[PDB]
Subunit: 104 residues, 3 copies
């Protein structure tokens, strides 16, 4: 399992939700944050409001989650953000105590 | 070392704190977020307020942290949340600069 | 690539930003959280406001990021916080779709 963490423009959250829902990814966690990226060009940078979306998915769904977020979050301009993929070794359902365990 | 990340109902934070404290886990980080899970049944789902609790513990304490959060955060109803366990390779104490390093 | 996660005193955020900027680390994500550490001594502990800073850097930059945060965030007193280093397997630029992939 992997956690896919996207830091995106706040006005794009709804699009990203819809794009993920349509591929069958409804569980997520959303946090309000501030971020800045690294920019190229003559300088002459504040932390801006952004939205963090986290989904934990099977290994075989990562490409598809990342494609959905990229398609729906991108504008083509600096500040679109980044997606990070991080290993999750165990995912526990609190309601039942059942757990998923990462492949060896 | 592992980071144990629980996304739980906000009204359960105090119970989860107490349950962790009693097993000797006092250090944590708490973030206000919004989340939704995936539900089963006839549809005919907003992001709700939730609370994220993170603790970084030794490899040998993960089962015990996860048991404490499950016992104290569960209600038996949809929306209880999830716990994710993620590898931490290094944990640095800012006050002293000392670090813990994961097993090879 | 690694994600370096620092939970620091809020009044130290600007110092930590400057110290990271000067070493060439401008991209970051900042979240307002609450935390407490574990303390030594006669008891006789609330969650306090803290600031989470995340940067995702190349494997070869982790020591340098961690040194910069420790130098600029430390006061020598309990409550300075912790830095966690977590594996990132893929980092995707949303603007272009290009990705960085961790070493095998």
């Amino acid at each position: 399992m992997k956690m896919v963490v996207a830091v995106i423009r706040p006005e794009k959250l709804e699009c990203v939700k819809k794009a993920l829902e349509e591929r069958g990814f409804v569980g997520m966690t959303v946090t309000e944050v501030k971020g800045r990226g690294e920019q190229k060009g003559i300088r002459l940078v504040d932390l801006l409001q952004k939205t963090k979306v986290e989904v934990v998915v099977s290994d075989d769904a990562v490409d598809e989650v990342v494609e959905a977020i990229v398609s729906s979050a991108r504008t083509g301009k600096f500040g679109d953000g980044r997606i990070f993929v991080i290993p999750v070794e165990k995912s526990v359902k609190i309601r039942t105590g059942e757990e998923e365990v990462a492949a060896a």
